[PDB]
Amino acid sequence: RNQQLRTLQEECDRKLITLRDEISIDLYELEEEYYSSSSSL
Amino acid sequence: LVVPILEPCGNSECLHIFVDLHSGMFQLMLYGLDQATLDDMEKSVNDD
Amino acid sequence: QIPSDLEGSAYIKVSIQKQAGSPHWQTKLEAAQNVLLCKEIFAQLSREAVQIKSQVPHIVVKNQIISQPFPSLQLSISLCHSSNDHLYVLEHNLHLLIREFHKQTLSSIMMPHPASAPFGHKRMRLSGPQAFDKNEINSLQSSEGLLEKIIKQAKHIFLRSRAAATIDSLASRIEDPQIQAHWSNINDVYESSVKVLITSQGYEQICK
Amino acid sequence: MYNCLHSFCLSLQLEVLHSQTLMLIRERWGDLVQVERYHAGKCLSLSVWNQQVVHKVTIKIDENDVSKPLQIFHDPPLPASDSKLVER
Amino acid sequence: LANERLRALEDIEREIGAILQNAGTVILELSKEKTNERLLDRQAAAFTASVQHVEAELSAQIRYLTQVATGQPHEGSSYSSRKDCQMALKRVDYARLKLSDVARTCEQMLEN
Amino acid sequence: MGVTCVSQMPVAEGKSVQQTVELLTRKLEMLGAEKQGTFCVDCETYHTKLMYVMHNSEYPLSCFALFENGPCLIADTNFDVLMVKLKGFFQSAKASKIETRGTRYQYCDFLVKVGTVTMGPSARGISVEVEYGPCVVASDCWSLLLEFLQSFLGSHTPGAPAVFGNRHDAVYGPADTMVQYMELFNKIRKQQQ
Amino acid sequence: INMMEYLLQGSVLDHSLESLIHRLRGLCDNMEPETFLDHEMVFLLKGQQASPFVLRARRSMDRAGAPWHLRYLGQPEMGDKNRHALVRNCVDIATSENLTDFLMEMGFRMDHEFVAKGHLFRKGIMKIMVYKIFRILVPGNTDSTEALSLSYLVELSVVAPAGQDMVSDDMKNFAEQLKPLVHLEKIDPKR
Amino acid sequence: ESGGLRPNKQTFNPTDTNALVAAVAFGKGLS
């Protein structure tokens, strides 16, 4: 049971990290946008 | 007790004196004060 | 048959306030184990809050720990026992810290690294053999509390939030020169980093 | 009947409080609160803010507590009159 | 562990069989015309054999326990791995929730 | 392991060994160095070729056994317990127990320790050790420590350790520090007068 | 204070190693086995005293940066029959690699060398080691060794202060409860 | 029937334990 659960957890973590990575790239794009917006209230 | 040192000042830079509900001793919390002077002042306060 | 006082569902609640399936038996057993773990967590927290000296002393009334990490905020760590604003990050950190403290005894490190020794802290053994310094690589050699670490983490989170909001306002209010911020990918529980840039609207290249 | 029932329930409350105090001393407080004197059915004295890091809180049962479970008595200090706090 | 399962099955089967045999034999005993003479003797033999077999099987199975028996209740548990995995799953669920909320806000933006 | 240098500075003059230590404390206050605790060194001697054991407070649980030019074993404190107990096949030598006890002053990443090798009950001499924890490589800080000693100590600044004399890029080590302590002890003993 | 080590020694044939290990893991604290390889060298001083001081130095060949261990174990203190354990004075000191040269320059002369391969389990204070002694083939050749005998060696040991003895009673009870799979008894070193 | 001396698998050899302890002590057949 231990091996199974550990593998499951690790796979989950890998997926999570890659997500963190993808979400971070999206965040970078948005941070480069919103900040550069003309707007000027 | 938030007692201020100087008249023109904000929330920080004022002596925050607390009382431990379990012990009763006085504990002072200054932002940038060194820990040795802090415990010395704590002892001097708890004495009198 | 669930043991008494382990019945119902319990979940520790940590909040920051700017004021003042399958097998049935499995569910019962897991709920009781989680209740026991949360009870141990809160017992350790209350003991460290009461019997350990620290700045800005804290208040424990029945099952709630009210602390002032900063002079202008309140941290409430209260155990909620149902007996039939929540920051899950701090609860997860509490659970992992308690599990680490539990694993400390079963730690593989402290288990006679060499052979026929005394079975204790092989890092400290190597430090004593290699003549380590008084405080450097010794001093306390891990001697903190769950409450202290949790408070430090909460303070860091608040500071980060504060800086973020401040820059946002600066970005919304002041629009003439520019403002930019690129938060780092990897952070820590007691640290973070940004990259502020102040360019112009049209001349990005030269105004660097 | 009322006198007997009242005496019994007040004595039961007395140690329901004594048991709670010893449980608090065991787990959380840890010598931060102490038991000065406990008389079963007469009074129970709890001391807080000890001299190390004194005051007592007595849970008396005297004569007839006609008005209420004998209003508690903070014997040593007799705290000052704070309208909001002394009522609680 | 299917070995233990098969053992139990055989046990139950043999027991039921022997009980039925005894029933039939006593029914033929009260019978006014016991036509099953040799048949009855065969049944008796079978029942005896069954009981002997059951006894032997039981003794062997009991030893099986003694070989692993020690009285000690055994400490080693999977509590560590289980707790870790539970924590991980809860964390992933929280992440999914946050992602869904952000997606919903983006949908709202598009809806105007 | 941070490059270190130890030398004997004459207490000299009519200034009492202890008063000379007070003058050294005044010089350390002038540097702005602040006390960071206390340090105690004690030694055990065994006539046999030649066995010396030096232990320094800064390293709390280690006991160093040095065999002259032969290798130094850095071992846990139990080592002292064991040598004492076995004793029968160990030379008792004499009361050569040499100890230097003095304050530790920390100046920006340099720890300076000035102490009086008190022989037995009577003080005689003075040992100064400047340790640079950031500098793990010997020779690179043989130069740094000579410069720092010329800066404070001024006159009577030494010529640097024998391991410093040896030309290697090898990391310095608490071992060489114990070696220096040993040579220092040897110097007061032979010095006599 | 001095450290006394309680030792109960018994043997297991290899064909029962599997079963023994299984039972051991099941009863012992929830850990994986540590799989330890240790090379031990014995050095003796031929002093004026008839008895020669014997110091054993062990280096882990399976791990990196693990300090050599010097252990001194004196004469047995066994007296009463109501303990069933070898109580001996134990001094254990972690040491640097130069230890070999230090000891030979100090006079200590190397005696024999035996590598040991086996598993380590701990139950509370108690530590159970099932190991096999491989008589080194060629003292220089740690690589080549000779299994001394087919049977592995099971040792149950508790090293505690002399005043403590409840732990030794616990060790005796635990060995007795391991009797159905295998027998651990106090065997005198003599013959 | 009847019953004889049949312990289920004997895994202990006393002569082997004695030899092992003696070797650990006097280094027999180890040099």
UniProtKB/Swiss-Prot annotation, chain A:
One of its GO terms (molecular function) is transcription coregulator activity. Residues 1-22 form a coiled coil. GO terms for biological process: positive regulation of transcription elongation by RNA polymerase II; positive regulation of transcription initiation by RNA polymerase II; RNA polymerase II preinitiation complex assembly. Its main location: nucleus. The keyword Coiled coil applies. Signal peptide: none annotated. It comes from the Eukaryota. It is found in: Nucleus. The keyword Transmembrane does not apply. Keywords: Activator, Coiled coil, Nucleus, Transcription, Transcription regulation. Transmembrane segments: none annotated. One of its GO terms (cellular component) is mediator complex. Component of the Mediator complex, a coactivator involved in the regulated transcription of nearly all RNA polymerase II-dependent genes. Mediator functions as a bridge to convey information from gene-specific regulatory proteins to the basal RNA polymerase II transcription machinery. Mediator is recruited to promoters by direct interactions with regulatory proteins and serves as a scaffold for the assembly of a functional preinitiation complex with RNA polymerase II and the general transcription factors. Belongs to the Mediator complex subunit 22 family. This is Mediator of RNA polymerase II transcription subunit 22.
UniProtKB/Swiss-Prot annotation, chain D:
This is Mediator of RNA polymerase II transcription subunit 14. Interacts with GATA1. Component of the Mediator complex, which is composed of MED1, MED4, MED6, MED7, MED8, MED9, MED10, MED11, MED12, MED13, MED13L, MED14, MED15, MED16, MED17, MED18, MED19, MED20, MED21, MED22, MED23, MED24, MED25, MED26, MED27, MED29, MED30, MED31, CCNC, CDK8 and CDC2L6/CDK11. The MED12, MED13, CCNC and CDK8 subunits form a distinct module termed the CDK8 module. Mediator containing the CDK8 module is less active than Mediator lacking this module in supporting transcriptional activation. It is found in: Nucleus. Component of the Mediator complex, a coactivator involved in the regulated transcription of nearly all RNA polymerase II-dependent genes. Mediator functions as a bridge to convey information from gene-specific regulatory proteins to the basal RNA polymerase II transcription machinery. Mediator is recruited to promoters by direct interactions with regulatory proteins and serves as a scaffold for the assembly of a functional preinitiation complex with RNA polymerase II and the general transcription factors. It comes from Homo sapiens (Human). The chain holds residues 292 to 388 of 1454 of the full protein. Ubiquitous. Belongs to the Mediator complex subunit 14 family.
Curated annotation (Swiss-Prot), chain F:
GO terms for biological process: DNA-templated transcription; positive regulation of transcription elongation by RNA polymerase II; positive regulation of transcription initiation by RNA polymerase II; regulation of transcription by RNA polymerase II; RNA polymerase II preinitiation complex assembly; skeletal muscle cell differentiation; transcription by RNA polymerase II. It holds the Pfam family Med20. InterPro entries: Mediator_Med20 (IPR013921). The keyword Lipid metabolism does not apply. GO terms for cellular component: core mediator complex; mediator complex; nucleoplasm; nucleus. It is found in: Nucleus. GO terms for molecular function: DNA-directed RNA polymerase activity; transcription coactivator activity. The keyword RNA-binding does not apply. Belongs to the Mediator complex subunit 20 family. Component of the Mediator complex, a coactivator involved in the regulated transcription of nearly all RNA polymerase II-dependent genes. Mediator functions as a bridge to convey information from gene-specific regulatory proteins to the basal RNA polymerase II transcription machinery. Mediator is recruited to promoters by direct interactions with regulatory proteins and serves as a scaffold for the assembly of a functional preinitiation complex with RNA polymerase II and the general transcription factors. This is Mediator of RNA polymerase II transcription subunit 20. The lineage of its organism: Eukaryota, Metazoa, Chordata, Craniata, Vertebrata.
Curated annotation (Swiss-Prot), chain H:
It is found in: Nucleus. It comes from the Eukaryota. Transmembrane segments: none annotated. Residues 1-15 are annotated as: Disordered. Belongs to the Mediator complex subunit 8 family. Component of the Mediator complex, which is composed of MED1, MED4, MED6, MED7, MED8, MED9, MED10, MED11, MED12, MED13, MED13L, MED14, MED15, MED16, MED17, MED18, MED19, MED20, MED21, MED22, MED23, MED24, MED25, MED26, MED27, MED29, MED30, MED31, CCNC, CDK8 and CDC2L6/CDK11. The MED12, MED13, CCNC and CDK8 subunits form a distinct module termed the CDK8 module. Mediator containing the CDK8 module is less active than Mediator lacking this module in supporting transcriptional activation. The elongin BC complex binding domain is also known as BC-box with the consensus [APST]-L-x(3)-C-x(3)-[AILV]. Component of the Mediator complex, a coactivator involved in the regulated transcription of nearly all RNA polymerase II-dependent genes. Mediator functions as a bridge to convey information from gene-specific regulatory proteins to the basal RNA polymerase II transcription machinery. Mediator is recruited to promoters by direct interactions with regulatory proteins and serves as a scaffold for the assembly of a functional preinitiation complex with RNA polymerase II and the general transcription factors. This is Mediator of RNA polymerase II transcription subunit 8. The gene is MED8.
